[PDB]
């Protein structure tokens, strides 16, 4: 129950909740309150230190940019014109957290500890397959509704911050998302290796809002489907139905989603903008290169046919195909597409004539500001590698998010290993050890 | 008379044992620890190298050390009463008297523990394998902290007690001897990683072949300290391992002896390796490679990259790492990758 | 009779085979066989490899005048990047080898197979009616292998910054790694070495304590190891003797007396350690670097006083200046 | 480049004489009885 009459030590205490539904419900609805509490508390904490004329990536804001991407509290070019959406999002999350925690403390100490004798619709069993598929169906429907909320924000409520808009980003309303399955599933057939890229390779908000419509309705149909269907034989012979197996699958899911998330936040710049988070990995290298070229060109040097101290270009090089790309060690990045670098790209890589005469102010200053702010830093937040001295302090927000979600994903992978093993072993029944009297190996032919 | 009284008062059972070894172990160990703790706290290294390495000077815990003596001392022990401080404590602290103090008193504390292990084993009535096994760290200690500076021209090239000062030793050894390319160090690294490999796997196998004797999921409570019946299926472990990897232990006595054998031998082979460097005999080159890289300038191997890198480590660390030579190199003779 | 599927499916899961081969095995074996062939051929008879994409090949093959210590399989080219580069995406096999082709070919199959091996361990333990989670302990060296061969390339943005498959090449990797990120002042690498040093240490003392407590079934002309006759029902030493030895050594509370706790701990220490350093490499791929202390002691004249961290920074600068042939001008880099 | 032909003889004897030592030791005790 709550001593060593349950079959778990204190350090495995939460496992006493496998057969008590109410106590388990209280535990989860109380923990939801913490996740929400930190959302609100952290953006209020960030905002108390926020200087709203200083770019967001050089002051450490990592929850205000998510709101900025939705094009609230921002003008054109990614400046702050008012700070009210930040305060209201944070404070309303912090307030709703109490309502969640209240339900927590009630169901944990006052509520019936079994909901199968109380209710027969909040009454559930991990071995009753029908109840799990029905709850799964509910949960798919509230996720379906959740997916259409972004589409509403995109089409009706002032749209999203488009960073591909003319003359730097601007908030733009989607007035025509793609509803074309060809383009949509085409992303899932691409190779994950560099050059091409998987779903991470999104480059416009039409596909984003379009895909949100697509995934929303497949899960509304699938959610309706699992209320009106009972699992099939091959499906039942492919699984272990236990209260822990579901947890194992879900840990497997969360570890995959973390690997995908850390890949996103490091490379993309459509859904994680360059005006609310810093430049990306290649973006700074390409910027350094671009501003160097621009500087040395004003002296009247020939940079278009210039050969190195190892030959093969000095400012520009040939890629394998034969496009004009950047030289030196900026020859491993030419898969980089930036909003600010693309008006200069000719029909086969950069066109040196466009460089001489079609430089707009915001482009060359974007390139120059991104040069001195490249993803590096240390674990005590001071910029650069170990040779340079502490006098500038930079850590890209990209690196914080990337490192955190990476290590949490690796640990969620090993947790999936653990819980799958426990669920499998407990099913067959040798998870308490090996029975003394009879053992398998004592009834198996000896290898020679 | 009085001897057998001194005997049974020492060899008596207590919360912590003392014995004849206690007489050597406890003063020496306590002084060496205490010395390091006051050295990391108040004592400078500004009259020796031009470093600060104490909390009183403003250094953190990752950058303090009790630093070595000066180069001009040679291999002098620097005794408090001796004719290099002449009965004076302040100068004795400044000149590095604490390094040798700590090193000698810790050297006798190691012999004390070694003897203590023998004595407790003779008393309890078991075999003394733990004391034979404990000779590997003493081999390493006297090969790295004593024999290596005694082969060189001073104590100055010995490692200073501190974490960053040991890091500087790692870089120094890599830079000047190319220490990873000497086979005795290869064998030591292997022996030590194999010790670490055996640890994880042996624990994991015994803990995952345990018998059912409990009631709870945790099986830590199904154990009584008696040996009357076996506590894990050895047969099952053998059958498992002979099938997933191909070879298995079928002899506990031999498994535990293999566990003793691998890292102690590793450390012994590495001790032979660092006494080989004390004469400056160092695996640093293969002559066939030099004559080939001489006749063909577009030959490259990773080994040639490592020698260019060794040039970088030496030429750039030498100035502030050997101040007693008063080295001055111009900025135009430092090695550079881009000058190639 | 029964049809070919049922016969195949119980031939695969045969746990009476001399060597197990699971459903994870049927996909493990080709990938590792291929990995083995490409390593043995490429270490021996590969052409030299242009790895810096400016026409300086590196020889890593024994036949072009290397011995064992210097040989390696030389990583893929800086020009190729993070691209998928099989034999049929090259114009000729000649230039696929020129761009460090076999390097990708060994490592993809090897990493895939090393995970399938992790699967096979669980399957055999499931077939023998023994406990799982030897496979959880295998996730530590495996995650370090991934970090070194796949994550660190993605992060730095090319497979040229992988670790070559060889001894001196591994050394080259370490030395450039230290210069560009200073891994020794990263706290996680410090827990990794603690876990290995402590793991080795606990192995040695565990070995000595158990082998010193063995029972007398022998004589002094035949080895001690013939006291165990295989699969005894009698544990082959007396725990309270070893416990009583250790209990006088440090103290009564510093000595385990439950073999089940001792072995859990014996398995737990280095595995946690190796996780921590594997993650340490993985975070440095995004360029979260070790602690750097430049001038922690400055006086009233406002002039610096060196620390040992400064001597290490001088060395780091030395190595790093040598690992840059790409120009004299490099202001804020990597990458 | 260079190969050293006394180094050849050095390995050749190093790997021969103990393998031969061990193969004789293993063969004479297995050729006797019970």
């Amino acid at each position: 129950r709550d001593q060593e009459s349950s079959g778990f030590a204190w350090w495995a205490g939460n496992a006493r909740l496998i057969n008590l539904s109410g106590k388990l419900l209280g535990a989860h609805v109380a923990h939801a309150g913490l996740i929400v509490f930190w959302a609100g508390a952290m953006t209020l904490f960030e905002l108390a230190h926020f200087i709203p004329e200083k770019p967001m990536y050089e002051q450490g804001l990592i929850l205000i940019p998510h709101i900025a991407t939705l094009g609230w509290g921002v003008g054109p070019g990614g400046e702050v014109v008012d700070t009210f959406p930040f305060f209201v999002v944070g404070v309303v999350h912090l307030i709703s957290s109490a309502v969640l925690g209240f339900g927590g403390v009630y169901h944990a100490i006052r509520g019936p500890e079994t909901l199968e004798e109380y209710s027969s619709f909040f009454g559930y069993d991990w071995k009753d397959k029908n109840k799990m598929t029905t709850i799964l169906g509910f949960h798919l429907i509230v996720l379906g509704i959740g997916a259409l909320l972004l589409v509403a924000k995109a089409m009706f409520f002032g749209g999203l911050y488009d960073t591909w808009a003319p003359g730097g980003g601007d908030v733009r309303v989607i007035t025509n998302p793609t509803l074309d399955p060809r383009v949509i599933f085409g992303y899932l057939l691409k190779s994950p290796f560099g050059g091409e890229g998987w779903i991470v390779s999104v480059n416009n908000l039409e596909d984003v809002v379009g895909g949100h419509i697509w995934i929303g309705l497949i899960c509304i149909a699938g959610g309706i489907w699992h209320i009106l269907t009972t699992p099939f034989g091959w499906a039942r012979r492919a699984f272990i139905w236990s209260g822990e197996a579901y947890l194992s699958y879900s840990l497997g899911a969360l570890s995959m989603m973390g690997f995908i998330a850390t890949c996103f936040v490091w490379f993309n710049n459509t859904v994680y903008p360059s005006e609310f988070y810093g430049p990306t990995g290649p973006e700074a290298s390409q910027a350094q290169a671009m501003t160097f070229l621009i500087r040395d060109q004003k002296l009247g040097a020939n940079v278009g046919s210039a050969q190195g101290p190892t030959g093969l270009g000095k400012y520009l090089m040939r890629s394998p195909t034969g496009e004009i790309i950047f030289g030196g060690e900026t020859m491993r990045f030419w898969d980089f597409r930036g909003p600010w670098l693309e008006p200069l790209r000719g029909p086969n890589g950069l066109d040196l004539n466009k460089i001489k005469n079609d430089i707009q102010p915001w482009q060359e200053r974007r390139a120059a500001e991104y040069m001195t702010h490249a993803p590096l830093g240390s674990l005590n937040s001071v910029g650069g590698v170990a040779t340079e001295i502490n006098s500038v302090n930079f850590v890209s927000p990209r690196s914080w998010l990337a490192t955190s979600h990476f290590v949490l994903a690796f640990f969620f992978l090993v947790g999936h290993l653990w819980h799958a093993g426990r669920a499998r072993a407990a099913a067959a029944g040798f998870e308490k050890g090996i029975d003394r009297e009879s053992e398998p190996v004592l009834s198996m032919p000896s290898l020679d | 008379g009085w001897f057998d009284i001194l005997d049974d008062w020492l060899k008596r059972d207590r919360f912590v044992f003392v014995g004849w070894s206690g007489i050597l172990l406890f003063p020496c160990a306590y002084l060496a620890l205490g010395g390091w703790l006051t050295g990391t706290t108040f004592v400078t290294s500004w009259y020796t190298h031009g470093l600060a390495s104490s909390y009183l000077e403003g250094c953190n815990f990752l950058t303090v050390a009790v630093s070595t003596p000066a180069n001009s001392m040679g291999h002098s022990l620097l005794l408090l009463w001796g004719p290099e401080a002449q009965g004076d404590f302040t100068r004795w602290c400044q000149l590095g008297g604490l390094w040798t103090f700590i090193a000698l008193h810790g050297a006798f504390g190691l012999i004390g523990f070694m003897l203590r292990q023998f004595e407790i084993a003779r008393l309890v009535g078991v075999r003394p394998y733990n004391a034979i096994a404990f000779s590997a760290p003493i081999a390493v200690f006297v090969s790295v902290f004593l024999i290596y500076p005694l082969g060189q021209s001073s104590w100055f090239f010995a490692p200073s007690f501190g974490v960053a000062a040991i890091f500087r030793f790692l870089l120094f050894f890599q830079g000047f001897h190319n220490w990873t390319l000497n086979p005795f160090h290869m064998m030591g690294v292997a022996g030590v990683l194999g010790g670490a490999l055996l640890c994880a796997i042996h624990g994991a196998t015994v803990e995952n072949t345990l018998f059912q004797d409990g009631e709870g999921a945790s099986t830590f409570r199904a154990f009584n300290p008696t040996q009357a019946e076996e506590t894990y299926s050895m047969v099952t472990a053998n059958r498992f391992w002979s099938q997933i990897f191909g070879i298995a232990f079928s002899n506990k006595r031999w498994l535990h002896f293999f566990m003793l054998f691998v890292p102690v031998t590793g450390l012994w082979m590495s001790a032979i390796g660092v006494v080989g460097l004390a004469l400056n005999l160092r695996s640093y080159d293969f002559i066939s490679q030099e004559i080939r890289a001489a006749e063909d300038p577009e030959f490259e191997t990773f080994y040639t990259k490592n020698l260019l890198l060794n040039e970088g480590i030496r030429a750039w660390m030498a100035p502030q790492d050997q101040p007693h030579e008063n080295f001055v190199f111009p900025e135009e003779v430092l090695p550079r990758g881009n000058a190639l | 009779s029964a049809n070919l599927w049922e016969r195949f499916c119980n031939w695969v899961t045969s746990t009476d085979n001399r060597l197990y081969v699971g459903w994870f095995g049927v996909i493990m074996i080709p990938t590792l066989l291929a990995a083995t062939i490409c390593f043995v051929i490429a270490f021996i008879a590969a052409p030299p490899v242009d790895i810096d994409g400016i026409r300086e090949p590196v020889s890593g093959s024994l036949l072009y005048g290397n011995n064992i210590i210097t040989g390696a399989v030389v990583p893929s080219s800086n020009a190729i990047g993070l691209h998928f580069y099989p034999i049929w995406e090259a114009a000729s096999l000649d230039e696929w080898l020129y761009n460090g082709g076999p390097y990708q070919l060994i490592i993809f199959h090897f990493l895939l197979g090393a995970s399938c091996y992790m699967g096979r361990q669980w399957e055999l333990s499931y077939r023998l009616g023994m406990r799982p989670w030897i496979c959880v302990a295998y996730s530590a060296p495996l995650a370090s292998a991934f970090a070194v061969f796949l994550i660190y390339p993605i992060g730095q943005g090319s497979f040229s910054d992988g670790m070559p498959l060889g001894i001196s090449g591994t050394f080259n990797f370490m030395i450039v790694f230290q210069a560009e990120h200073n891994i020794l002042m990263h706290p996680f690498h410090q827990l990794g070495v603690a876990g290995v040093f402590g793991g080795a240490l606990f192995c040695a003392m565990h070995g000595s304590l158990v082998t010193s407590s063995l029972i007398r079934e022998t004589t002094e002309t035949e080895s001690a190891n013939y006291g165990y006759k295989f699969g005894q029902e009698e544990e082959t030493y007396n725990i309270v003797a070893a416990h009583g030895y250790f209990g006088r050594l440090i103290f009564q509370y510093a000595s385990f007396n439950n073999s089940r706790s001792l072995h859990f701990f014996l398995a737990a220490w280095p595995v946690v350690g190796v996780w921590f350093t594997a993650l340490g490499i993985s975070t440095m791929a995004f360029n979260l670097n070790g602690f750097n202390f430049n001038h922690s002691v400055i006086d009233a004249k406002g002039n610096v006083i060196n620390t040992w961290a400064d001597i290490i920074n001088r060395a780091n600068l030395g190595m790093e200046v040598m690992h840059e042939r790409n120009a004299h001008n490099f202001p804020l880099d990597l990458a | 480049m260079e190969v050293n032909q006394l180094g050849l003889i050095a390995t050749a004897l190093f790997v021969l004489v103990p393998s031969v030592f061990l193969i004789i030791l293993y063969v004479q005790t297995e050729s006797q009885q019970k």
Binding site: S446, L447, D448 | V235, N238, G246, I247, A248, S250 | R18, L19, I44, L62, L63, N67, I68, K229, F230, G231 | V3, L8, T11, V15
Partner: peptide, 30 residues
Amino acid sequence: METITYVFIFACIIALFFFAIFFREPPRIT
């Protein structure tokens, strides 16, 4: 000259693996 010595030793080591696995001395319970 040098390459032959190397590969002969590697060849001896993998033959030893085969013999050591498939022609062992059979451990058998009493």
